[PDB]
Structure 1
Amino acid sequence: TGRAVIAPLTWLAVTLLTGTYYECAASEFASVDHYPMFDNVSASKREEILAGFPCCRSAPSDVILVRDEIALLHRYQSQMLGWILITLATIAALVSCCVAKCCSPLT
């Protein structure tokens, strides 16, 4: 399990720290209550533009302020989640090694 764990933890840590994967994954789950620009009584176009602007839409129509703010929010959440994950992995590894030493009947 030592090697079996060091193999993918690097992938998860690097991908979360870069943050692009997490951004493209959880873009559509962003909230719109904070931003008055996303009223959209239609309640269907708003979801589409929310899932659309992160990818390639560009199209500067002065909404790019909200795009940039929410992108920074998701990037920060991604990197903090990566730090939480690596800290938990290290703590689990140390605790597992200690438990292995304690539970080992051999000297």
Structure 2
Amino acid sequence: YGLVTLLTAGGERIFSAVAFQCPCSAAWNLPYGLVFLLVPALALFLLGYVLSARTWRLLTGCCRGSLVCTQISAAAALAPLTWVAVALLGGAFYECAATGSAAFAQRLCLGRNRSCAAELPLVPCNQAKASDVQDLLKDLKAQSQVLGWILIAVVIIILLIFTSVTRCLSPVSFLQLKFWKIYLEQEQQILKSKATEHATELAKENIKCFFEGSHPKEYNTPSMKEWQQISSLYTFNPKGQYYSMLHKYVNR
């Protein structure tokens, strides 16, 4: 129960701390909204850019490259766009971003109170009492939510076009591509299991030879150059089907 209690206490403290006041300030407010917009989005973007093993496969070993790079970048930027869309649909962040540069304010307000730019930042702060801005905060909330929805539409549209073109111009058919992906999945799982047990037997043999203090068996050597040879990325040629470059490397 200790873990449960500590986790609930930590979560409550965390959320009470992420309380979003949108401080009404003449000039220090814009960055307040801007960081709450960009930084968590950038964070999730980075985590996506990190997590996928496909890019790591390319990166290791002392560092056409455009296609794979834009593919991985989009496949990772999927999620941060979802976060920023959800936040922008939250409305609070952009509502705080209302002020921004003075150009936005001067172009923005209808000029009714003639005192917009002076103490506009008070408008999400609810401290200003001019009727014009008390209605204008609502319109700004609207612009935030609307922009968010427009973004979540643009992102799905881009995903459509991306996946469709990537699915349109490939030489291989569909019912084989599905089977190929199943193949790669099975290969990954089999590799995990058998490499695990092979490393296990290697360790067992070596540690027994250490306790005894004698020569090892010298059963076989997984060649490191071979490892690099099978780490190739592209895995296609119309003639030599040979998926999974390891499999391509069975002729010699």
TM interval, shorter chain, is 0.7 to 0.9
Matched, 1:11 2:83: yes
Give structure 1 stretches of 5+ with no counterpart.
41-45
- The Cα offsets for residues 28-77 of structure 1, whole Å up to 9 and x where unpaired, read as 52333x24321x5xxxxx52312x31354616xx41x2222111111101
Alignment-derived partner of residue 97 in structure 1: 163
Q: Any runs of at least 4 consecutive aligned residues in structure 1 with deviations exceeding 6 A, and if so which?
A: none
Q: Is the 8 A contact 1:23 1:75 kept in 2?
A: yes
User: Within 2, Cα distance between the matches of 1:56 and 1:95?
Assistant: 42
Matched, 1:79 2:145: yes
User: Within 1, Cα distance between the matches of 2:99 and 2:134?
Assistant: 12
Matched, 1:37 2:113: yes
Q: Which has the higher contact order (CA 8 A, sep 6+)?
A: 1
Deviation at 1:94, TM superposition (A): 0.8
Task: Report the structure number with the largest CA radius of gyration.
Answer: 2
SS at the partner of 1:21?
A: helix
- TM-score, normalising length from structure 2? 0.34
Q: Is the 8 A contact 1:23 1:71 kept in 2?
A: yes
Sequence identity, in percent? 38
Matched, 1:20 2:95: no
Q: Give the counterpart letter for 2:117 in structure 1.
A: E
SS at the partner of 1:23?
A: helix
Give structure 2 stretches of 5+ with no counterpart.
1-71, 174-252
Q: Give the counterpart letter for 2:87 in structure 1.
A: T
Q: Give the counterpart letter for 2:168 in structure 1.
A: C
User: Within 2, Cα distance between the matches of 1:27 and 1:73?
Assistant: 13
- TM-score, normalising length from structure 1? 0.73
Across the aligned residues of Structure 1 and Structure 2, the Cα RMSD in angstroms comes to 2.2
